[PDB]
Design a binder for this molecule. Structure first.
Ligand code: HEM
Ligand SMILES: CC[C@@H]1NC(=O)[C@H](Cc2c[nH]c3ccccc23)NC1=O
Ligand SMILES: CC[C@@H]1NC(=O)[C@H](Cc2c[nH]c3ccccc23)NC1=O
Length: 395
């Protein structure tokens, strides 16, 4: 119909041109309709409006996650009949900030050493390869797998890692699998943690699941299972998608990489520019109005859901001059790659650490290049978190 359906099917790094058109329109909030559910939704694409939305206490993230809320995703992201309320269930047990605690600066200082070791080990193995090699399979996959085992869940079997990864790729989708396959993904994940979370949390290590389980009524197995599913969904396809996308951005900008090779102290700024420039989610961050309000003049009624596309905001020319240029020296406002306000990614420091290690491993080795044109890269169509099927590269 004449109301836009959402999302915009921009599964590659080419952002849908619709986002810029909506940004330039006379509306600061645009009504859309969910393709997967038919629910009405509002969509924000301007940086200035997005700041107002994500800093407004009248907009609730948790209320937008509740069953029956208008939503963009085709299937509810919980096992049927369960809360799907992991952060609140941790808060209920007295686990104030266990998430941010176990992912903050002290955790980076524990893990950054082996993270950089592993990035170097992986890249050094690639430096010995002939012909074309795959940076997705042979760099991003082992690095992200080690990240999830060592920092989030505990030492996983290869079969366990393969299983959780498949559940993430199957359930976190707008399309490409059946309804039944999508629910079975969130079923199989929840069933998986109900049985194995206690054992995983009990092994020696610093992993977040152990911290959650071993912090001060006892922690129910349903809450520990909800925490496991939370860490997979929030930590696994995001890190793997982003690292793949960041590598593509670097390979597409050899002049920038040459600068980082010569001046490695500029890597942290390049990390921030990657977080702004490289797209990740194909949907949007969402919030529910808990009372009638106006945002930039547009009246929103209690119960309505307003979305912000982080990609659209990160490419807003009102915020970032030449927004479609990858400019590591950039000194613009804070990017939205980790969101904004109360729900700012609590994994942001760990993510920055793994991104930095990846950038350094690339910048240290001149000659790395994409083996084919960018438009020939194949993409997993329909994922919430963009990811190419492979990244063929050569020296
Ligand atoms: C490059 C990697 C990552 C990116 C780009 C990213 C991005 C984001 C963004 C944009 C949000 C805000 C969502 C919103 O406002 O509704 C968020 C929230 C969150 N992130 Fe990250 N993330 C990454 C990695 C991770 C990792 C490794 C973890 C580890 C578990 C993690 C855990 C979380 C959690 C639990 C939330 C929910 C916070 C809340 O709703 O209050 N993230 N992330
Ligand atoms: C993480 C699960 C849960 N659900 C939410 O809608 C928000 C936003 C969010 C952050 N990371 C995601 C990965 C996949 C889907 C949604 C999200 N916060 C939550 O904690
Ligand atoms: C539509 C299905 C799913 N629902 C969400 O709430 C998150 C919000 C979000 C936007 N960009 C991100 C990057 C990393 C982690 C979370 C997010 N995105 C989704 O795609």
């Amino acid at each position: 119909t004449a109301t836009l359906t959402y999302p915009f099917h921009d599964w590659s790094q080419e952002l849908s041109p619709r986002y810029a058109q909506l940004r330039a329109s006379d509306a600061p909030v645009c009504p859309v309709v969910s393709e997967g559910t038919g629910d009405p939704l509002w969509l924000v694409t301007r940086y200035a409006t997005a700041v107002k939305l994500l800093e407004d206490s009248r907009f609730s993230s948790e209320a937008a996650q509740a069953s029956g809320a208008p939503r963009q995703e085709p299937v509810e992201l919980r096992a049927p009949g369960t809360r799907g309320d992991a952060i609140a269930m941790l808060r209920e047990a007295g686990l104030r900030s266990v998430l941010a605690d176990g992912l903050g600066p002290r955790a980076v200082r524990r893990h950054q050493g082996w993270i950089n070791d592993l990035a170097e080990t992986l890249m050094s193995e690639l430096a010995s390869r002939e012909g074309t090699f795959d940076l997705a399979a042979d760099f991003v996959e082992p690095l992200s797998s080690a990240l999830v085992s060592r920092t989030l869940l505990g030492e996983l079997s290869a079969d366990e890692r393969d299983l959780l990864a498949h559940c993430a790729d199957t359930g976190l989708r707008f399309c490409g699998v059946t309804h039944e396959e999508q629910v079975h993904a969130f079923t199989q994940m929840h069933e998986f943690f109900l049985e194995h979370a206690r054992r995983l949390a009990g092994t020696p290590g610093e992993h977040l699941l152990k911290l959650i389980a071993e912090a001060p009524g006892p922690l129910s197995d349903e809450a520990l299972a909800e925490a496991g599913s939370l860490l997979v969904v929030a930590g696994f396809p995001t890190s793997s998608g982003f690292l793949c996308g960041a590598l593509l951005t670097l390979l597409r900008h050899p002049d920038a990489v040459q600068e980082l090779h010569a001046h490695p102290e500029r890597v942290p700024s390049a990390v921030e520019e990657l977080l702004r420039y490289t797209p990740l989610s194909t949907g949007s961050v969402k919030r529910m109005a808990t009372e009638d309000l106006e945002i930039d003049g547009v009246r929103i009624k209690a119960g309505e859901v307003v979305m912000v596309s982080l990609e659209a905001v990160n490419h807003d020319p009102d915020a970032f001059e030449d927004p479609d240029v990858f400019r590591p020296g950039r000194e613009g406002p804070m990017h939205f790659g980790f969101g904004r306000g109360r729900h700012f990614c609590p994994g942001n420091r760990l993510a920055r650490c793994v991104i930095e290690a990846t950038v350094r491993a690339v910048a240290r080795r001149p000659g790395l290049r994409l083996a084919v044109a960018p438009e020939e890269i194949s993409w997993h169509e329909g994922l919430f978190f963009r990811r190419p099927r492979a990244i063929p590269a050569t020296w």
